[PDB]
Amino acid sequence: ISVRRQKKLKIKKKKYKKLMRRTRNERRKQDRL
Amino acid sequence: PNKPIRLPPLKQLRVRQANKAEENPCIAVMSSVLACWASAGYNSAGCATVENALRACMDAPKPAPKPNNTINYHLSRFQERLTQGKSK
Amino acid sequence: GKGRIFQAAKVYQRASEAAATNIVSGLPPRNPPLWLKAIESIPPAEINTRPYPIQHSPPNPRARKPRNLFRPTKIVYPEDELRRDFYRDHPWELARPRMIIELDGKDARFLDWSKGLRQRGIPLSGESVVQRQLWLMENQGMTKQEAYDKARHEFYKLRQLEQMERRIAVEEARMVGGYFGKDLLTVGMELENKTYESWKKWATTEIARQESARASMY
Amino acid sequence: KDRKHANIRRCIETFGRHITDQSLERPTPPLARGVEPKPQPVRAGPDTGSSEVQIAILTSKIRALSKALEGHGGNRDKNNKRSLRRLCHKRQRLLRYMERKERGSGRWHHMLETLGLTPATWKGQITL
Amino acid sequence: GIQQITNMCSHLQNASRARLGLTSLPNTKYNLALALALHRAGFISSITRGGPHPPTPEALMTYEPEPVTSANVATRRLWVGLKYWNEEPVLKELKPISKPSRLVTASLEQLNRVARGFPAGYMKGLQLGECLFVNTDRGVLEVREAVERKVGGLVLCKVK
RNA sequence: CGCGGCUCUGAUUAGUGUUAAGUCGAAAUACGGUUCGUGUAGUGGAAGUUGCACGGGACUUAUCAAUGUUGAACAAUACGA
RNA sequence: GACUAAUUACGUGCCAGCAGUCGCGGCAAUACGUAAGAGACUAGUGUUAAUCAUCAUAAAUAGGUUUAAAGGGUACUCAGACGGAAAAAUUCGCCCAAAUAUAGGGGACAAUUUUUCUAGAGUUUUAUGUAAGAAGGUCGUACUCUAGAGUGGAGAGAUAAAAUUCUGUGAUACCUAGGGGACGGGUAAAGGCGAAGGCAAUCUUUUAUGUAAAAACUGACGUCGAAGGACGAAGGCAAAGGGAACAAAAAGGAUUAGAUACCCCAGUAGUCUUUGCAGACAAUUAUGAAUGCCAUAGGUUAGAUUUUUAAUUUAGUCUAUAAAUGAAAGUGUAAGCAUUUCACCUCAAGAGUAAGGCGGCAACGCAGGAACUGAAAUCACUAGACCGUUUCUGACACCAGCAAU
RNA sequence: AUAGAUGAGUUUGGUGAUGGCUCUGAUUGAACACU
Ligand SMILES: [K+]
Ligand SMILES: [K+]
Ligand SMILES: [K+]
Ligand SMILES: [K+]
Ligand SMILES: [K+]
Ligand SMILES: [K+]
Ligand SMILES: [K+]
Ligand SMILES: [K+]
Ligand SMILES: [K+]
Ligand SMILES: [K+]
Ligand SMILES: [Mg+2]
Ligand SMILES: [Mg+2]
Ligand SMILES: [Mg+2]
Ligand SMILES: [Mg+2]
Ligand SMILES: [Mg+2]
Ligand SMILES: [Mg+2]
Ligand SMILES: [Mg+2]
Ligand SMILES: [Mg+2]
Ligand SMILES: [Mg+2]
Ligand SMILES: [Mg+2]
Ligand SMILES: [Mg+2]
Ligand SMILES: [Mg+2]
Ligand SMILES: [Mg+2]
Ligand SMILES: [Mg+2]
Ligand SMILES: [Mg+2]
Ligand SMILES: [Mg+2]
Ligand SMILES: [Mg+2]
Ligand SMILES: [Mg+2]
Ligand SMILES: [Mg+2]
Ligand SMILES: [Mg+2]
Ligand SMILES: [Mg+2]
Ligand SMILES: [Mg+2]
Ligand SMILES: [Mg+2]
Ligand SMILES: [Mg+2]
Ligand SMILES: [Mg+2]
């Protein structure tokens, strides 16, 4: 996989990684960690 | 100690500067003039012989260019024989 | 593939078929090339078929998985061992020029080593000693050292007379008014003069160069 | 290292097939149906390749290594943890083959009781 | 084992691809059977078992090999004489059909159909020049030699 | 009647897809103007950015201060661009 | 319109509409809507839906995974597949050969088993060589802290330039005497060692493989290997130490239109030690492991043989090629010819995401979809152009000079 | 049972590949529209 197509996966993992952090307390309340 | 390697196949075996690069002579003479001014002084007496030497170069005519060194021609002949070969 | 598809071995096959029939169906085929019938009964030889090369020395019988089976072997004769021994005992025998330019190749037809070192067509050199040595060692059942001594000693006596003739030749020649040119000794010294003088010039220049280069250190 | 090569001599002199052919009562395995014994050439040298000798030598190596991993700071040596699992497995393949090859020979029981090689050493999977 | 025949088939391809005059093969009862078949069909020049070094080429057929006892059975080896004609090898391809992972067997009714350019089972029809060797109780015969003898069995290799 | 499963729905809230003509930056592709990606841990409206090790899918893109030779005279019926 | 047999005219003007796919329509449209003609099937003709085939497009027959979807981080190993030589017993597998064939024949091959063999795999003979690993101790260059009512007496350090900053409570600079932590200069190489991850100062202690040469020994004891278990970089979590240096974070000073940044003054976790958790990596040779095999050359690493000068030779490693192979780039001890076995792939996007579940202190890991929306995504090469790319070459393009706006 | 194995359009500035989509063939206990 070229670097150009690896950057499309790079922006998918960052947004998800950043999403789990943001919504970590919300998932801790509902016991969904 | 190992011996020199066998060069890989190159596009062209040659030397960039076939003929030596001649440095302007009195550029060094100017350095001496500047040096004396620093230590002795601008309006001094020991700088006469040094300053006069700088005026001597500009008046003198520049030497003529040397004959080209035909070294790249012979390197191209023995390229395929010396190295692994030619690439293209 | 940097190579190209060569078909030089099938020129007859390809050409013969092309000349079988005409391109205009319904006509007699035109006459073929003039060379088609010349090499009709001379097919090309087989190429590119690695055979078992000739074994000039017994192959290693212990090797269970031998390599380089299709590689030509080195040619070694019994003389090689003797030549190495002699020429190592007489290193200055190599300064004697020896011509390896064969005239007609028929030089081994008049060589009979039973007579002596002197032979027809070949000069007196280390080779004659080796061949003579080998002969005595084989025919006369002598040892390597014994045969070496005998033949070697004959070589000396023949060389002694050769050197004696030179001195006696020039000496006797002058007794009757015979003058010669510059000997090799004198000529050699002259060339050194021309070369030594050139070294003096270079030395003087570089010496002066360093002196001028030493003024800049201070 | 000096002991390592001194114990190998003890294993070749104790379990060597060239010494157990007379010390043991029934060294060879029992003959099969119809098979009749025949004379064979003598061994030119000492028997050092038999499974008994190999299994004995592996046992000496396993003890030295296993004894070095239980000493001070032995857990930190996590790279030789595979060396022990490779000797026990290498010994399992010789015991598993020597079992069915000897099929109860006196030469096979003398090694077990002497070295203490219990059935866990080869019957299943050695998990470490 | 069938793995030997597969190794033998692959080797003869490489040896012919390298345009070699001689070729060595491990001396086995199986390899010899297929070698005699290739020779009986006209693919290889000669067959002679010898040591790790090839016999005297000039006296290949006159070469008298020594007895094969247990003292030298490990060094014996079959020496095959490859054949080349018209700047082209005679044993170009030796694709195998019965591999160690699966032993493909053919019947007489299927071999009759394969010997005329018609597929049958896990095989394909034979075209001009192609040849198929089948290992039966009558030895390693050719598909057309097994059809006249009315037998079948293990299919070794397809020779083109 | 209890327990578990399953279906629909749920204030509130999240992600993603499509949509030429909006906005804010200019991150990547050239040494892309801070080498770029991998893992991991932080950080910032966003693209981004920082630490630590790692990969080349980036530097083999490499091209003389060894400066390059009176290597056996001359003359002859030998030799003769 | 082309695929797909068969044409013009007018109207409309990215509007109305056609469309299975690519597409057509913006004022002279062969594609839309009328008119005529033409091509074709015909009591049927088209369209929609579905099925097979197309599709080797889940490939048993019969695929593939370096750069395009796809090799597991690793190899010891249970199950399970597969695997030597020469004979023999049994099954009668396999074949004649069927009709799910009674009863027989044939013996190459196959299954279980027996007896022998040494070519695979191993053991012994302290190899040589070697940054695999681990324990207990030390060495040194620099750095840093304290002390000297040290010498010296106003600057120093930083940066493209500065600022914040250090200094008269005596700094930088040059020394003396102690203390304290982690680091590994040269050697050093296309070098080497381990299953990989990874391993480079030094002494002792301790550990498994591997390589060379000869003999001897066991006698197929072999290869791969789901799972389980073990190991696994940096970072991270937990506890107790350590704390010189470096440095996420937090914070300050500049730059800038703005500056989170890049740069700078400083600086906490952390890096280190011990005991556990964690298991993700461009964990790469973008190439699983192993076996059989195919022509040469030049280096190089550790040995061996020899007429040890220099050549043969075993096991590795790296360049350049032949045959060949490949989409090509290229490889050419393999990305070739074959084989064994395991893992993995089946258009893009959504997505390595959701839900349930397992593991974990947590971070997160394993495993793993569908809906909605598309006709394309994707790889190598070729020729150009561009480059705050290299080296050049022409031009009042520029330098310089004069004049002018 | 021995005649039975077939392609086309579409990615790119362009070429060769990879890989889907669609058409070409046959059919239905079919429906619908015009007849
Ligand atoms: K960047
Ligand atoms: K910050
Ligand atoms: K198009
Ligand atoms: K991976
Ligand atoms: K002080
Ligand atoms: K596993
Ligand atoms: K700031
Ligand atoms: K080599
Ligand atoms: K989802
Ligand atoms: K101008
Ligand atoms: Mg990929
Ligand atoms: Mg440690
Ligand atoms: Mg709701
Ligand atoms: Mg940028
Ligand atoms: Mg950049
Ligand atoms: Mg980075
Ligand atoms: Mg780049
Ligand atoms: Mg490059
Ligand atoms: Mg048409
Ligand atoms: Mg219409
Ligand atoms: Mg129309
Ligand atoms: Mg009808
Ligand atoms: Mg891998
Ligand atoms: Mg894993
Ligand atoms: Mg089997
Ligand atoms: Mg029978
Ligand atoms: Mg039978
Ligand atoms: Mg023996
Ligand atoms: Mg062996
Ligand atoms: Mg040693
Ligand atoms: Mg050893
Ligand atoms: Mg003082
Ligand atoms: Mg210290
Ligand atoms: Mg590494
Ligand atoms: Mg060092």
Ligand SMILES: [Mg+2]
């Ligand atoms: Mg190694």
Ligand SMILES: [Mg+2]
């Ligand atoms: Mg035996």
Ligand SMILES: [Mg+2]
């Ligand atoms: Mg294994």
Ligand SMILES: [Mg+2]
């Ligand atoms: Mg760690």
Ligand SMILES: [Mg+2]
């Ligand atoms: Mg830690």
Ligand SMILES: [Mg+2]
């Ligand atoms: Mg802590």
Ligand SMILES: [Mg+2]
């Ligand atoms: Mg700092």
Ligand SMILES: [Mg+2]
């Ligand atoms: Mg663990």
Ligand SMILES: [Mg+2]
């Ligand atoms: Mg790594």
Ligand SMILES: [Mg+2]
């Ligand atoms: Mg594996």
Ligand SMILES: [Mg+2]
């Ligand atoms: Mg290396």
Ligand SMILES: [Mg+2]
């Ligand atoms: Mg190469």
Ligand SMILES: [Mg+2]
């Ligand atoms: Mg291939």
Ligand SMILES: [Mg+2]
């Ligand atoms: Mg997908």
Ligand SMILES: [Mg+2]
């Ligand atoms: Mg989940």
Ligand SMILES: [Mg+2]
């Ligand atoms: Mg997964």
